[PDB]
Amino acid sequence: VGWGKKETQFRGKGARAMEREALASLKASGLVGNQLRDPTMPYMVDTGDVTALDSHEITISWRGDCDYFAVSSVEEVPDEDDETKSIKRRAFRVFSR
Amino acid sequence: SGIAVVAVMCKPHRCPHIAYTGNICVYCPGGPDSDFEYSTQSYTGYEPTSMRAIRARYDPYEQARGRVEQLKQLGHSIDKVEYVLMGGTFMSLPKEYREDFIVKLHNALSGFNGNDIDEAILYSQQSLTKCVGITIETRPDYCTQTHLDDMLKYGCTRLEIGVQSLYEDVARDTNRGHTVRSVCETFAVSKDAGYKVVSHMMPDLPNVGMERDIEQFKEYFENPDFRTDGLKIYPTLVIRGTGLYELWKTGRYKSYSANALVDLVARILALVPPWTRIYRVQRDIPMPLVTSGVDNGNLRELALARMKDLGTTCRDVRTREVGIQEVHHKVQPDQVELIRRDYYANGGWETFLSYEDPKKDILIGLLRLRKASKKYTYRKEFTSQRTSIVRELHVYGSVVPLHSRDPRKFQHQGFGTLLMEEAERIAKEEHGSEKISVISGVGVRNYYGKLGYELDGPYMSKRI
Amino acid sequence: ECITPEAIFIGANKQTQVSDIHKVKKIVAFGAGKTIALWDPIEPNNKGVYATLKGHEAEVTCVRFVPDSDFMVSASEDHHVKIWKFTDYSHLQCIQTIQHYSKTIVALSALPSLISVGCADGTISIWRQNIQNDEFGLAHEFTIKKGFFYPLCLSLSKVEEKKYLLAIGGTNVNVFIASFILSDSGIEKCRVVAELEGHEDWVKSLAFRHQETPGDYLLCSGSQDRYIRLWRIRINDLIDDSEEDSKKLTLLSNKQYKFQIDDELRVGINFEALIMGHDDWISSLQWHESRLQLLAATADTSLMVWEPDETSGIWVCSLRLGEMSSKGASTATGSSGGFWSCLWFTHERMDFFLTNGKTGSWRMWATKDNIICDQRLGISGATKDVTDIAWSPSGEYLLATSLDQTTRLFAPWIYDASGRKREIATWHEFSRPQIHGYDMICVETVTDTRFVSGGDEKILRSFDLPKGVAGMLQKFVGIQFEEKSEMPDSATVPVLGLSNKAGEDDANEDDEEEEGGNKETPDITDPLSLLECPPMEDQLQRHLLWPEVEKLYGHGFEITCLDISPDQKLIASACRSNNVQNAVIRIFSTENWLEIKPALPFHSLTITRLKFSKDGKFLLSVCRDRKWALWERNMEDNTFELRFKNEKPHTRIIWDADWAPLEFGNVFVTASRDKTVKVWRHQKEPADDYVLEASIKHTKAVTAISIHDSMIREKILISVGLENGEIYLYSYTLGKFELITQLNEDITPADKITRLRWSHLKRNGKLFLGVGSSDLSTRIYSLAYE
Ligand code: SF4
């Protein structure tokens, strides 16, 4: 989805900042005062570790017109962040006729 | 009569939300970086207004004067004109440019030749060829309180802040720099100031199905946050120069057929609440440069045939308007009644009053009233006690003929007074307010100064 | 030791009360920028503007000479009014200020010992001076109607020794007329006494003609409704009667306004005639002296002269001037711009009609007794800030751009159409190079007839020269241009100009024609009708453009600064920023117009000055972060490398730096907002680098510097300018600051100086200096240093 390149100049995201340079004789700086920008998440997404009181059964659900359905379970994700940490995460998937 | 719309253009620039996403939003065509490069964004430069702007090298004075004189010479005489601005994000530009622009746009009609915008607007109040407001286009990131004060000083009356979707992946995948939820607080702060707010929508977008398109509109009209006073629907058309054509080139994009789109429009028009004005389902497009989509010149001309085959025809303002004088007075109307609706929208209670025929559902005049809340008001006028605001007065009831014994030679010249006193009644009794205010363009600051309203700041107010 | 101001360039405003004349002397004094410029048309020499009276702070609106007296009053946007008195035969000086009127002033008119001021607060003030003290005392300050009235124009008339009237118009449809009588210092019995009917829009022009036959005269009025009407006024014993006590049919519109002013004077006013037939709003109405004629100017630039009709009784326009079709700078259809002022006067019998243009260009017509007319030489100048200067390589015609996208091309007039030298040469604008939408910040000249420019777009452009201009210059400025025949034919008039034309699509529609002045270099004029003066204002806007040659990209923002190599082969350029990666320099070769791969990353802020050394070996780089560098070039591939650097030269930002000739051994000088001028000298005994010699400081920030081309008597020249507008001239040798002079405050551009440039082609035993400031001014000085 990314596209941030302009020829004859240095662009593309990761480090590039501005397109609206302006000056002031007293060393102005900052576009501050504009909250909630960049709908990309501020940091890597949260995990889904289960709480203690939860049970561990298998649930199956249908839809109104009965064409698709969903089933839930608990996966053991490997968590590449640490090659010794693996997380038990509650998640569901969708299947068809 | 003589309502006039004179569009103007601003100098080319770049909206800064590109800075933290890299490029323009995908569907935006043209722009300074594109091959045209002498044109503001979202306009290819091939429109007649673009031609008239280029030959003037993007100057407001010449564009306004030339368009006004051309319209006057064609055969219509003008005494009521509303300006509309276009292109990019006008508010991004530096301080002095906007001030000079506004002063020139007012001195073009006033005939004044001064500076110090306060004096310019003061002279424009007492001028012929009255101005009935301005329409400024701006983005959520630039609607902070300082900018709102600037717009209130300038003389603007209604904004148009696009959202284009309510899902959250679309905002990041279309390279538009704002989360969806912030637009709600933008609406909340804007409405309490008396600014009529209109939005945009585009039915088909990448990674969006017909279903999601249906219930996004349903949630927009049902949820007490997305209730606004207008709408514009832009069917997605693929121009070669856009970032949308690259997706089709790489095969990462496909469009709807004709049947699917006409069915979608038919369903959508059968849900509009009766206080929102559907502006243009049949919008204006650069025709030959589109590569994907369908014809859009007569979408509603077939959607109407669809509702006649399914029932529950449209109920918007536009289809039910009768106009100022003799638009559909070829037949004598029927029973005239007063209809009053109340709704909760953006942390406040609002009232819509109208004079309508209930047997055939036509519209003659309408009024909007808002009870100011306590968690959004910041103006020193509205932070001293309870108050209510008349966001819009609209009187097509200047009609000479009517049903149920119209005034003989008085011909509904006191018709608006009925609605004004009706509003004051519930302001004194139900709201329990201690001050009532009305917002209007500077040119019409006298049609309200006769009923007793007195001037404070940019507002026309009177106590109780 | 002295100087001589060679030229003064400025443009008029777009107001209506700006122009003013002094009939006994005919000195056109008009406001411009924040000052008041003076000019005189009646002279065998067409010099132009010679002095700009200063003192104001904001833009001037209303200027009025007191009729046949020794004073002059001005009003500015600074909410102030200033008095001026003749201190010389052709020079004035401020004598008094007015400290009332928190709001600005819109209307102004004056007669001896009276001042009328219309304050946009909504009030009208009348002042009368003292018998022996020139301080104009206050007599009255009243209001026509608070809350709903704002004045636009005022006028005055003297009924008798101590009795006067006053007319008021503005945001209404009626003309108000009040009266008052004199006293010791004040005025008593002053109130509105008549409200004349008439127009359906705002009053815009008033005019009281003198009293030929005592007590009866005429008033004219024009309004935004495009109609002009008249009103006759009579004193007692001549007032029209039979209105009272006589069986006559009184019409609705023929009402007579009678008023008993005092115990012995009653005045009757009636309506006379309706004059129409115009295309836009009236802007200026002016009377005459020997005729019942008026001059009418519209917003369509059209000029009309209205005269009485002895046959039909209803006045018919006599002469119609301005049939040329022109709207703005770019003309498509119709005309626009209008005329925002006017003056009308005859010297012996040549009538003269002068009006302000749409781009600060005066247009003046002389005429032979109402029959035939001819346009004479006018004035032109900049309407916004003047940023960048650039001389010709040979020491000739200079290019001075501005913020109002009006590139300039001035030139001296040395061939005076008699085949000989003009006894006193005068400077004029001879060509308008380029016009476009952007602002055209930077411009540089590479060869005799080529230049490279850049505005606020991210591209640079290089232009060409047409043919007609070459011959016109070699006729008037005269100096020989060798091998000019190689250039191909070009055009004159584009419908819309991004640049002129250099192709076969069009041609030149003017024939080779030596209309006059054929006694110097005959048949040099490339196809054109040879004038007797520099090109006309009608010609400047659409004929003298230079076609473009090449476009070149490379930057990521708008262009900031560029410089040309001494070999005329390489060029360097850079744009402004505050990031590290957008503060670099890019270079191009003139023979191919292409980018060279390597970059030059050293700075983190905006590049301020770009300057190659005296020889094509070193490049200087200066910025705002107080860091400067010198880069070395390899003659083989023209690439560069960083050699010398320094990081703590000053504390405040650096503005400008200039080089030194090859004779003295590669010295340079830096000037910084620390008000500091430091001189950097070279030394290599204990370390190969550049060392510091000395420095000086002033009381205000320095802005730009320039050093003369060569050395005079084992010493060189130096010029330094401030943001206050002053100019200092210096003589300097190694370690010795030999101050020459501080230039007069009576001649300086009042606003911040931007660029000072020393010329090289000395002639008449003197050199030339070009000054460009943000005071809407561009000036030329001469140095006959001994
Ligand atoms: S915000 Fe508006 S101007 Fe900017 S890229 Fe999107 S559509 Fe174009």
Swiss-Prot record, chain A:
Q: Phenotype of the disruptant?
A: Loss of mcm5U (5-methoxycarbonylmethyl uridine) and ncm5U (5-carbamoylmethyl uridine) from tRNA.
- The residues forming a coiled coil are none
User: PTM details?
Assistant: Phosphorylation promotes the tRNA modification function of the elongator complex.
Where is this protein found? Cytoplasm; Nucleus
- Role: Component of the elongator complex which is required for multiple tRNA modifications, including mcm5U (5-methoxycarbonylmethyl uridine), mcm5s2U (5-methoxycarbonylmethyl-2-thiouridine), and ncm5U (5-carbamoylmethyl uridine). The elongator complex catalyzes formation of carboxymethyluridine in the wobble base at position 34 in tRNAs. Functions as a gamma-toxin target (TOT); disruption of the complex confers resistance to Kluyveromyces lactis toxin zymocin (pGKL1 killer toxin). May also be involved in sensitivity to Pichia inositovora toxin.
Q: How does it assemble?
A: Homodimer; dimerization promotes ELP1/IKI3 stability and elongator complex formation. Component of the elongator complex which consists of ELP1/IKI3, ELP2, ELP3, ELP4, ELP5/IKI1 and ELP6. The elongator complex is composed of two copies of the Elp123 subcomplex (composed of ELP1/IKI3, ELP2 and ELP3) and two copies of the Elp456 subcomplex (composed of ELP4, ELP5/IKI1 and ELP6). The Elp123 subcomplex forms a two-lobed scaffold, which binds the Elp456 subcomplex asymmetrically. In the complex, ELP1/IKI3 interacts with ELP2. In each lobe, ELP2 is tightly sandwiched between ELP1/IKI3 and ELP3.
Other remarks on this protein: Present with 10500 molecules/cell in log phase SD medium.
**Family recorded in the similarity comment:** Belongs to the ELP1/IKA1 family.
What protein name does the entry list? Answer: Elongator complex protein 1
Portion held of the full protein:
194 to 290 of 1349
From Swiss-Prot, chain B:
The cofactors required by this protein are:
[4Fe-4S] cluster
Domain Radical SAM core: from-to ranges: 1-288
The UniProt record lists the EC number as 2.3.1.311
Would you say which domain of life the source belongs to? Answer: Eukaryota
Mutagenesis or variant effect for C15S = Eliminates iron contents
Effect caused by changing Y234A: Loss of elongator complex activity
Outcome recorded upon mutating K196A: Abolished tRNA modification
Query: Outcome of mutating C15A, per the record?
Result: Dissociation of the elongator complex following assembly. Abolished interaction with KTI11 and KTI12
User: Pathway it acts in?
Assistant: tRNA modification; 5-methoxycarbonylmethyl-2-thiouridine-tRNA biosynthesis
Q: How is the cofactor bound?
A: Binds 1 [4Fe-4S] cluster. The cluster is coordinated with 3 cysteines and an exchangeable S-adenosyl-L-methionine. The cluster is required for structural integrity of the elongator complex, while it is not required for catalytic activity.
Q: How does it assemble?
A: Component of the elongator complex which consists of ELP1/IKI3, ELP2, ELP3, ELP4, ELP5/IKI1 and ELP6. The elongator complex is composed of two copies of the Elp123 subcomplex (composed of ELP1/IKI3, ELP2 and ELP3) and two copies of the Elp456 subcomplex (composed of ELP4, ELP5/IKI1 and ELP6). The Elp123 subcomplex forms a two-lobed scaffold, which binds the Elp456 subcomplex asymmetrically. In each lobe, ELP2 is tightly sandwiched between ELP1/IKI3 and ELP3. The Elp123 subcomplex binds tRNA through ELP1/IKI3 and ELP3 and can bind 2 tRNAs simultaneously.
Also noted in the record is: Present with 4760 molecules/cell in log phase SD medium.
Q: What is this protein called?
A: Elongator complex protein 3
- Provide the gene name from the record: ELP3
Q: From which residue to which, out of the full length, is covered?
A: 94 to 557 of 557
Curated annotation (Swiss-Prot), chain C:
Q: Which domain of life is it from?
A: Eukaryota
Pfam families tied to this protein: WD40 (PF00400)
Indicate the segments annotated as coiled coil, or none if absent.
Answer: none
Disulfide pattern: none
Listed transmembrane segments: none
Query: GO molecular-function annotation terms?
Result: microtubule binding
Pathways per UniProt: tRNA modification; 5-methoxycarbonylmethyl-2-thiouridine-tRNA biosynthesis
The UniProt annotation puts the region (Disordered) at 488-528
> Which InterPro entries is this protein grouped with?
Elp2, WD40/YVTN_repeat-like_dom_sf, WD40_repeat_dom_sf, WD40_rpt
What segments bear the compositional bias annotation Acidic residues? Answer: 505-515
The listed outcome for R652A is: Dramatically reduced interaction with microtubules but no effect on interaction with ELP1/IKI3 or ELP3
Q: Where in the cell is it found?
A: Cytoplasm; Nucleus
Q: Which UniProt keywords apply?
A: Cytoplasm, Nucleus, Phosphoprotein, Protein transport, Repeat, Transport, tRNA processing, WD repeat
User: GO CC annotations?
Assistant: cytoplasm; elongator holoenzyme complex; nucleoplasm; nucleus
Give the sites modified to Phosphoserine: S490
Please report the residue spans annotated as repeat (WD). 11-49, 55-94, 100-137, 198-241, 277-316, 334-375, 381-420, 435-473, 554-598, 602-641, 649-690, 697-740, 748-786
List GO BP terms, alphabetically.
Answer: protein transport; protein urmylation; regulation of transcription by RNA polymerase II; regulation of translation; tRNA wobble uridine modification
Task: Fill in the domain comment.
Answer: Folds into a two seven-bladed beta-propeller structure which is required for elongator complex assembly and association with microtubules.
The UniProt entry's sequence similarity note says: Belongs to the WD repeat ELP2 family.
| Miscellaneous comment as given in the Swiss-Prot or TrEMBL entry | Present with 6090 molecules/cell in log phase SD medium.
Q: How does it assemble?
A: Component of the elongator complex which consists of ELP1/IKI3, ELP2, ELP3, ELP4, ELP5/IKI1 and ELP6. The elongator complex is composed of two copies of the Elp123 subcomplex (composed of ELP1/IKI3, ELP2 and ELP3) and two copies of the Elp456 subcomplex (composed of ELP4, ELP5/IKI1 and ELP6). The Elp123 subcomplex forms a two-lobed scaffold, which binds the Elp456 subcomplex asymmetrically. In the complex, ELP2 interacts with ELP1/IKI3. In each lobe, ELP2 is tightly sandwiched between ELP1/IKI3 and ELP3.
Q: What is this protein called?
A: Elongator complex protein 2
Q: What is the lineage of its organism?
A: Eukaryota, Fungi, Dikarya, Ascomycota, Saccharomycotina
